[PDB]
Design the sequence.
């Protein structure tokens, strides 16, 4: 039933290494049986029930079983279960490539479109049919069989390269060792948490909770230099080898499919449509931010000269990559009176989580209840059940996995586990999501204290959770977050706006000892500090967006060189010789390849919506929140992104709101 919880979460995290391997093969047997059945049908005999429905039914069954097999590599504490899940993921990705490239299925899907009365099927059924054919042509099934086989050969190779690129980064355990003197100006609560080694020194990993606090706060520039050198050479040798194979393969395949470049190939499936529009979007936006960057660079450089004079260090006359976060943090302290180590005392994990959940219950018309003694992949992970408030309909569940450990995904993300789609049964399948982040854990009496950007990250991922859960579609491939890649960061970045509002921030905050609120004064300063460093922060995102495009267009260019070019030309902060940032750039192997612009692309749509509707009619208004839920979250990828923006805005979007959020004009 669509009004109940029990029996609707089919997922299990019991699995032994043998159980993953055996179920991978079983799943392939069961799924291939359906594709064989559809392929065996005569061309004249195919119909909705035995071809279209049969494939869509098995897609649901496949995707659900697959996430019990491919997800444990990201969250299990057992190393052997992670490797089995990894090897399962590689196998199943080769299986996907085989089924996607079957000419007999593609032949029958095309025949069904010409002969079937397209007006009698649902609009999303027409979409399934149009997209399935589009995929077929994008997999080269219109080309000769000898070309198809070559394309297949390279796609299997590219899959394994992509999986190896990210595995190398998650499995990395590079550390550096420093004395107490070398970690100067880092707080005691940071340094006491670190592991002591021989010769009374401390161990610093290159993880996000270690790296950024050192680069932000450490006052010894040699320490910052060594940490940045280490961070931007993680997996250098092995992932440089991967990129040198990966990028030319992407080109070679794209050219065989009839595209000039790989960037052109991916852009066709995005709201931006074409690489010309992306290049124009980034160059135009780079131009507008240029004066902000020039001003921010000049203030930072003056500030360095003062600190170098005061502390008596040598002054090299430039902003190095290792100086960038340090003086950006310091600019925030001087201009907005914000100490992030003071401010986090007001954001304890329990108070933030409660505040976050209360915010979006009210806004989106939902009810969350935590489940007790829930089946989970770790003791520290919790499970919540999402209900519609008015109807009482059970929309989905989400897991919260907030704390770091050995083997876990290093970065912030949201994973789709179950789609919110129709079954063969006729009933609705319950959506399931996992919020994955890395904030400190409670030590003794001191609880987990969140910095403001950690709260924002928490809100970011919860935007993906709500998208995954509120999305109700007929078919599995359109459900949840399966939208255009350059649209998928609309719902996530949207929710970040509630972390820059005074009323919302007061609702999210409480001091951990005495329970006092943040001062009215300091809340104004926090909301006003949104603009601080915005030039260089946005300019860095343009560098990455530009690099990502360049590496997927002209693929006879050195990746590190290309990064250093845009670093100097756009950001005005040089990449340090010997470091290759692209080799660490996990988005290039995690499905944002040629699509990293999508963050900035989406932020235009998120700000335009936030300013035009939410900020006008009150940011906690249920009618606007329900209008957002129904028009943006609910359809999933069953409609185009730009149509879903049109339905909400009643017009095409524009950059006015985005530009106002940066402090510009048009
Ligand atoms: Cl052949
Ligand atoms: Zn995101």
Sequence:
């Amino acid at each position: 039933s669509s009004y109940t919880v029990a029996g609707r979460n089919v997922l299990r995290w019991d699995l032994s290494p043998e159980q993953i391997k055996t179920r991978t093969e079983e799943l392939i047997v069961q799924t291939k049986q359906v594709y064989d059945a559809v392929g065996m049908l005569g061309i004249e005999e195919v119909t909705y029930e035995n071809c279209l429905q049969a494939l869509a039914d098995v897609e649901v069954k496949y995707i659900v079983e697959r996430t019990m097999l491919d997800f444990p590599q990201h969250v299990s504490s057992d190393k052997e279960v992670r490797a089995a899940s990894t090897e399962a993921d590689k196998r199943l990705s080769r299986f996907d490539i085989e089924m996607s490239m079957r000419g007999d299925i593609f032949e029958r899907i095309v025949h069904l479109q010409e002969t079937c009365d397209l007006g009698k099927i649902k609009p999303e059924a027409r979409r399934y049919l149009e997209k399935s054919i589009k995929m077929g042509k994008r997999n080269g099934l219109h080309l000769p069989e000898q070309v198809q086989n070559e394309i297949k050969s390279m796609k299997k190779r590219m899959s394994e390269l992509c999986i190896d690129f990210n595995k190398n980064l998650n499995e990395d355990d590079t550390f550096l060792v420093f004395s107490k003197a070398e970690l100067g100006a880092l707080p005691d609560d940071f340094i006491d948490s670190l592991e002591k080694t021989d010769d009374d020194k401390y161990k610093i990993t290159l993880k996000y909770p270690h790296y950024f606090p050192v680069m932000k706060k450490c006052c010894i520039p040699e320490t910052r230099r060594r940490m940045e050198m280490a961070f931007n050479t993680r997996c250098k040798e092995e992932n440089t080898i991967i990129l040198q194979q990966l990028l030319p393969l992407r080109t070679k395949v794209a050219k065989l499919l009839g595209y000039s470049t790989h960037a052109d190939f991916v852009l066709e499936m995005n709201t931006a449509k074409s690489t010309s529009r992306v290049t124009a979007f980034l160059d135009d936006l780079s131009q507008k931010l240029k004066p902000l960057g020039e001003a921010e660079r000049e203030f930072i450089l003056n500030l360095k000269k003062k600190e170098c004079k005061d502390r008596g260090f040598e002054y090299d006359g430039k902003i190095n990559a290792w100086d960038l976060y340090y003086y950006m943090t310091q600019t925030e302290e001087l201009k907005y009176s914000i100490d992030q180590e003071f401010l986090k005392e007001y954001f304890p994990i329990e108070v933030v989580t409660e505040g976050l959940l209360n915010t979006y219950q009210e806004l989106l018309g939902l009810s969350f209840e935590q489940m007790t003694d829930a089946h989970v992949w770790n003791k520290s992970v919790t499970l919540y059940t999402v209900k519609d408030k008015a109807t009482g309909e059970v929309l989905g569940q989400f897991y919260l996995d907030l704390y770091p450990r050995e083997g876990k995904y290093n970065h912030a993300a949201c994973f789709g586990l179950q789609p919110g789609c129709l079954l063969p049964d006729g009933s609705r399948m319950m959506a399931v999501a996992a919020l994955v982040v890395n904030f400190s854990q409670p030590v003794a009496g001191r609880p987990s204290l969140l910095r403001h950007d950690e709260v924002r990250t928490y809100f970011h991922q919860f935007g993906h959770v709500m998208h995954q859960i509120c999305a109700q579609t007929d078919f599995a491939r359109f459900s949840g977050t399966n939208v255009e890649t350059d649209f998928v960061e609309v719902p996530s970045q949207m929710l970040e706006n509630w972390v820059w509002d005074v009323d919302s921030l007061r609702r999210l905050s409480k001091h951990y000892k005495d329970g006092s609120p943040i001062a009215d004064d300091l809340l104004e300063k926090l909301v006003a500090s949104r603009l601080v460093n915005t030039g260089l922060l946005t300019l860095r995102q343009i560098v990455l967006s530009k690099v990502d495009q360049s590496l997927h267009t002209n693929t006879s260019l050195d990746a590190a060189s290309e990064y250093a070019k845009y670093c100097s030309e756009i950001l005005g902060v040089a990449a340090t010789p010997g470091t290759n940032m692209p080799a660490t750039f996990g988005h290039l192997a995690g499905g944002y390849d040629g699509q990293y612009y999508g963050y900035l692309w989406s932020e235009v749509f998120s700000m335009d919506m936030f300013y035009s509707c939410f900020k006008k009619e009150g940011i906690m208004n249920p009618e606007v929140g329900m209008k957002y839920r129904n028009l943006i979250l609910k359809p999933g990828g069953s409609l185009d992104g730009m149509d879903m923006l049109h339905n909400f805005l009643k017009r095409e979007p524009n950059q006015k709101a985005f530009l106002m959020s940066r402090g510009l004009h048009a």
Observations:
- The chain has three domains: 1-138, 139-347+499-666, 348-498.
